[PDB]
Design a protein around this ligand. Structure first.
Ligand SMILES: Cc1cc2nc3c(=O)[nH]c(=O)nc-3n(C[C@H](O)[C@H](O)[C@H](O)COP(=O)(O)O)c2cc1C
Ligand SMILES: Cc1cc2nc3c(=O)[nH]c(=O)nc-3n(C[C@H](O)[C@H](O)[C@H](O)COP(=O)(O)O)c2cc1C
Ligand SMILES: Cc1cc2nc3c(=O)[nH]c(=O)nc-3n(C[C@H](O)[C@H](O)[C@H](O)COP(=O)(O)O)c2cc1C
Ligand SMILES: Nc1ccn([C@@H]2O[C@H](COP(=O)(O)OP(=O)(O)OP(=O)(O)O)[C@@H](O)[C@H]2O)c(=O)n1
Ligand SMILES: Nc1ccn([C@@H]2O[C@H](COP(=O)(O)OP(=O)(O)OP(=O)(O)O)[C@@H](O)[C@H]2O)c(=O)n1
Ligand SMILES: Nc1ccn([C@@H]2O[C@H](COP(=O)(O)OP(=O)(O)OP(=O)(O)O)[C@@H](O)[C@H]2O)c(=O)n1
Lengths: 372, 389, 374
């Protein structure tokens, strides 16, 4: 259960944010060794990383040579996380440099490698960085899309920790395969009002919707995410946020952005009905099916971009295979998980995290779009 | 003059003390050696060791003795640059084109053959960045030796080849700059080498005086040019296993043919350079004044006939070896072409106890030189033939 | 465990990069090795090198790790201390009883065997201060390897030699007394090659190791050794041993003839072939002839007073064994399939171990026989 993680820290202003990544990985029961660059010590000192990780902090290969630390750290690692990954670090990782303990450890690691780049937009968008990021991606490393006045800010420490424990559970979880895919996602419970202060709502976290949006984003999809009431979820890096209120405001937001979308995933738990009298200081009216309405602009001919629609269902193997054909979605998800597509294929989602399940969902979407 | 100027670059690997004997052997062979270590190499082996072994000063940066314009004169005057060990860091700097210490600045300056001898932990060696860099150095004209694998649990490639292997591959490039193109990639080659031992008893036996140097040389040259080489060796003159070849040790000629028949199906090229014993001893006792002899099987003929009977499909080139002393009944090329059509070989190496003859009709006079230089002429023709077939 | 603890000390000679191969070899043999360099050795080989090979920390003075009592525990837990190279300066400090760095402090506290492998320029080695210091260390119970051979003596012996002798002292502490000073010895080793024609021949699977061992142990105990070698398993010349190679068994007979006069000990350890082929073809069924018993030829000349100086002859290869010695005429006989029979009837069972170990027993028996007539 307790995995061995290396946390590489390169020399960026965001280095103090790695402290939080180390503390959380440690709180989750994991064994963390911090390997900073020399230039990271100009930002956070070895003492801080030594107290948070509980293990010694060294920057070069020529210390504790008797314990062969330049190979053993990488050979025994279950994951390598670099946060922040500077342009310089990425440039060295691509070149295959091994001139400090962090880059030598990268060459030795035969485990998943997660870069969380952080830098100024101009650096991130410079053609050397762009090619370097592409090369690391095609070599099998995960390079998180940074957050956004432009792109380049380090993703929040929770997003990095979550994606780290994801790769610990499933090494192939985040291939850079959904490039060029545009995706509108919905998540969170909607709030149907009856008062400028009071309302009716439900208990959905939004986590699985957010999880699916995050996994799409970190696999290359240009994601747009319309959220309602969430369990205080913070926005995923690189996804465009559109916050909404009512189950009606959800519909308008969908039909505002859905034409540009290539893929749409209804994870929102929209409430069935809706009140009709809103006193400014029990008259319900049943709300429209936003998912089912999408399949119809589908047919009526104004979604010549849409190539996949996925639905979420609440708990029976065969009892649900009817719902996908009836609802007209390209595939449907349900957990008491099981995934069912419109080609008859069905698979049971082995138990896991909302993000781990989100990867199975995003896998089944990629396969569907291949079959076209 | 036969005295060449060698630059020995030493990068920061555990193997740096092995570079010491490399410089000792090259100076003992009359060459003039300048050692250019990286700064990290100095934490493994001291400058004083290299100054005493080479007799020349040892510096790591370009800003020393800039009056003697050493950052260019050191490269401009070298006949060979050898890097041993070449670390993953150093290969990466050479590929990027860095010139930030004296060694890498010498690499941009040198116009002579350039020999890297990598040494690393296997995981560094198989890392995609390392393998891309090795490919780029090779496409750019450098020779990058395939490392050794010397075990049980911590085996795998990445070990520095033995100094003798490095020094004799260094001398090869001093003699022939184009000796080691990476051209045999994708071919599997089976090589026999050495003499055989035909037992009279457990203790005594009949044998010949074969050193094995010929076959080992072609195995080595094949390995260092890309081939996945297997080497069936009998008795040799204490020859170290070449870097990157699978080794199989046999005692007798019967034991050789069983070993050849065991590995020939996976092979693309077979090199019969082993001096195989013509006749055996009739009775093998168990302890100890006229001993009878029985003829052994012609394993080389055994392979061509099995090939013509469809039992060796992926076999594409069978090269035999022949010893020669003078020509009277015809010329040497006349009798060799007859020996080549009769045995069914694709290539015949006639040893002047050089001549290279080919089933395509090619013939070539091998000039005198080192056994390893002759192996490159041989491997050239094995390549030339495979292009034809 | 068979895992013994070895201290390899390294002093500041050009030969320090050769100690790296000693450390690796002792480590491949399963032992735990702690390298203790002098400060001036770090000018030649870095601490980082010795750390990667030894797998153990590398320190140079006594004040590091004072908590885990290293100034003393490094010596009093060692099973062997080998110094390679041992410079003149190190030998002088060891004789003085200096302890001003970790290596010298370790030497004063060790109670196991101590093996010095000196290496230096010949003028340093033959300077009277060094000569005296080498004699004091030998007198005091240390083993000081005679170094190898500009062309003079003082080269570090090969690593394989040092590790061989290191593992020998791990098996027998008293194995290399400096007892055979002045003795002229001549040894034969290896198999022999009787040619049929210029390229073919008939050989035997003799390694030469057992004969090389006896020549090595003799030279490192004080003797001047001439080794006549046949076909060996690619063996390296022992340091301090005039080498003479031979081919056929008559070429050996010819070689023992030239050199046996000057000698005081003959160790007929070669596996000489008894039969030679009928004729050399210079290019069926092979008839053969017989070769001279070299050992029996050797006892005859001694018996006819042709070898005045030779005081001991040893043969090789105890039901009929005691009779074999009396029939051979040899002074001692080594029987392997060990047992060592003497020319005064006393026999001893050489408990089988390393070849070099039983070589020290063979030299033991030679030593007692030479002191018999002294
Ligand atoms: C205050 C400050 C903040 C920096 N932030 C970043 C950054 O966020 N990303 C980046 O690539 N470089 C950043 N740099 C530049 C790096 O310090 C520089 O590239 C350095 O060599 C670190 O690389 P390394 O940690 O991989 O060795 C910053 C520099 C300074 C002075
Ligand atoms: C004990 C030890 C052994 C090492 N061995 C190697 C090696 O064999 N190959 C390698 O590429 N790197 C090795 N390294 C990593 C290098 O020391 C490091 O990459 C160094 O910066 C290489 O730089 P250079 O280009 O100056 O050699 C080793 C490091 C240590 C501590
Ligand atoms: C390149 C060089 C090689 C040397 N080699 C030896 C040597 O092999 N033996 C020796 O006794 N002194 C040698 N010396 C001289 C010194 O005595 C030696 O390096 C050092 O001072 C001895 O100190 P130590 O006790 O640490 O060995 C050498 C000096 C140099 C500069
Ligand atoms: N007002 C609503 C309510 C539900 N949804 C969508 O409908 C699906 C689930 O509704 P349904 O087809 O009725 O199946 P259930 O799981 O039973 O519905 P519920 O959410 O109430 O559990 C989800 O994909 C959700 O996006 C919708 O379109 N608009
Ligand atoms: N029993 C044997 C003996 C020889 N060979 C192969 O055949 C070649 C030489 O056979 P041979 O006809 O005896 O060669 P010659 O032309 O007579 O020259 P020489 O024997 O002196 O080498 C060598 O390549 C050897 O590898 C073989 O396969 N089987
Ligand atoms: N031609 C020979 C053969 C034997 N020896 C010596 O004799 C010893 C071996 O004894 P040996 O009598 O040859 O052993 P056996 O196998 O019994 O041989 P033999 O028929 O002679 O008894 C060795 O020291 C060896 O060097 C010798 O001097 N010359």
């Amino acid at each position: 259960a307790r995995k061995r993680i290396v946390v590489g820290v390169a020399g960026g202003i965001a280095a103090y944010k790695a402290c939080t990544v180390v503390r959380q990985l440690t709180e989750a029961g994991h064994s963390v060794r911090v390997v900073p660059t020399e230039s990271a010590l100009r930002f956070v000192g070895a003492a801080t990383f030594e107290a948070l990780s509980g293990n010694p902090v060294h920057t070069g290969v020529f210390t504790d040579v008797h314990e062969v630390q330049h190979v053993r750290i990488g050979q025994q690692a279950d994951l390598v996380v670099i946060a922040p990954a500077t342009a310089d670090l990425l440039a060295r990782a691509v070149a295959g440099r091994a001139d400090d303990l962090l880059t030598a450890t990268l060459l030795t690691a035969r485990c998943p490698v997660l870069f969380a780049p952080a830098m100024h937009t101009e650096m991130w968008l410079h053609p050397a960085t762009v090619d370097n990021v592409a090369t690391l991606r095609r070599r099998g490393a995960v390079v998180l899309e940074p957050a956004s006045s432009g792109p380049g800010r380090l993703p929040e420490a929770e997003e990095i920790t979550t994606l780290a424990q994801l790769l610990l559970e499933r090494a192939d979880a985040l291939p850079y395969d959904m490039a060029g895919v545009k995706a509108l996602v919905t998540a969170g419970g909607t709030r149907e009002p009856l008062d400028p202060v009071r309302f009716i709502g439900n208990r959905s976290s939004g986590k699985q919707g957010y999880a699916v949006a995050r996994v799409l984003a970190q696999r290359g999809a240009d994601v747009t995410l319309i959220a309602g009431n969430t369990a205080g979820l913070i926005d995923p890096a690189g996804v465009e946020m559109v916050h909404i209120g009512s189950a009606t405001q959800l519909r308008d937001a969908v039909s505002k952005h859905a034409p540009d979308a290539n893929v749409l995933v209804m994870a929102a738990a929209v409430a069935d009905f809706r009140p009709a009298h809103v006193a400014a200081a029990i008259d319900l009216v049943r709300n429209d099916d936003v998912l089912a309405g999408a399949v119809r602009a589908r047919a009526d001919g104004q979604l010549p971009n849409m190539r996949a629609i996925v639905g979420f269902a609440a708990e029976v193997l065969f009892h649900a295979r009817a719902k996908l054909e009836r609802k007209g979605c390209d595939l449907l998800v349900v957990n008491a998980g099981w995934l069912l597509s419109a080609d008859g294929t069905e698979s049971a989602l082995e138990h896991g995290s909302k993000t781990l399940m989100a990867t199975r969902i995003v896998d089944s979407i990629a396969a569907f779009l291949k079959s076209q």
